[PDB]
Design a protein around this ligand. Sequence first.
Ligand SMILES: *[C@@H]1O[C@H](CO)[C@@H](O[C@@H]2O[C@H](CO)[C@@H](O[C@@H]3O[C@H](CO)[C@@H](O)[C@H](O[C@H]4O[C@H](CO)[C@@H](O)[C@H](O)[C@@H]4O)[C@@H]3O)[C@H](O)[C@H]2NC(C)=O)[C@H](O)[C@H]1NC(C)=O
Length: 370
Amino acid sequence: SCPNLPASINYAANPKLPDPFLALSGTRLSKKDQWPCRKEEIRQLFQRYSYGTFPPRPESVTAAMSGNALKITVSEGSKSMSFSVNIKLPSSGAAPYPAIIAYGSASLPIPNTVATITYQNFEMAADNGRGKGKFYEFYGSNHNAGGMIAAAWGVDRIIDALEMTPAAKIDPKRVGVTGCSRNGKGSMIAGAFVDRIALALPQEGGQSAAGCWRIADEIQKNGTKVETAHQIVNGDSWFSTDFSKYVDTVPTLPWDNHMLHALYAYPPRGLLIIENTAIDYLGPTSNYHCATAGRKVHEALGVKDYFGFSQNSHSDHCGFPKAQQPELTAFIERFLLAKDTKTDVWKTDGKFTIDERRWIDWAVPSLSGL
Ligand SMILES: *[C@@H]1O[C@H](CO)[C@@H](O[C@@H]2O[C@H](CO)[C@@H](O[C@@H]3O[C@H](CO)[C@@H](O)[C@H](O[C@H]4O[C@H](CO)[C@@H](O)[C@H](O)[C@@H]4O)[C@@H]3O)[C@H](O)[C@H]2NC(C)=O)[C@H](O)[C@H]1NC(C)=O
């Protein structure tokens, strides 16, 4: 349906967030029916420069309920791998149930109307181990995928297995995803690459997730210690070994993380970013300005209200404040509990400067076809 990227891309150093509506072809999007092919371009850019290859569904996926365990087996040629996820069914409403996949564990309050699928994402592909995890046992240790995109592949397989196994009692069309800190990152990427996810809730994922690389670079340049591209490729195997060629030349990247958010605008799905203005290393002003740029794609495609942003000041990392509950309730209501509640939430309590034009030198086009 869409072409692959040129063998090589020449992108002139740009100190602002690249126009998400500007195809590498050269033509700027003016028609809705062009967006799908730009969306793949973006997906392919992320995999080449930062994430590694997000593989397709393997030749076999099979699943099997075994008590509360959903045991998912896959194979490709003679190779086979199994990974198990715990499902804790809720105590309110009737099957098939809406669910949330938690990277390791939730730090959001999940209502008693929504199932809790507990995904062992570091078990799938390790936190700080190059080529370690089920993913790499299956595909090879030398496979160029990073532990973030390999975890996201596991979420694609989790949903394949819920489509195959009504026994699990989970509506496949209403599976959310969430995580905090490192799993804010994972959950954000899972939701960006798995189109079938109904709602992503990344919490305090900061840079790589909510924040843009260019703004992290400028936060650093201004004196405050923050999670820059240069920093993030060190304590972990989250990104492909290729990412560390580019960390020092961010302005020449034909993309930024605002285009990760853009992947959520088609097919339209819920994205509430929950963030913390108090912790410097997240880059509070990056998160806000980066998100605000990402939502421009949602705005063009008339699905603005499917992308929520909430930034709150709290000393404790990953402690959900009660202040952010109405916003979380609303997004769970609309996209998981199939209720009809409004979700235009875009707020920070942060006291930094809010200047869009600093990062966004491009206009939201009127897309015809919608
Ligand atoms: C990194 O630090 C640099 C420091 O240079 C910083 O870039 C600068 O940001 C400031 C803050 O916005 C810019 O200064 C602005 O300039 C306009 C006029 O040119 C002023 O009117 C703005 O002020 C208003 O805001 C005040 C408080 O909100 C109001 O009380 C007041 O009445 C005005 O309405 C403001 O001074 C400056 O132009 C840029 N400089 C450059 C080089 O672009 C950058 O913001 C910092 N980056 C990060 C990541 O923090």
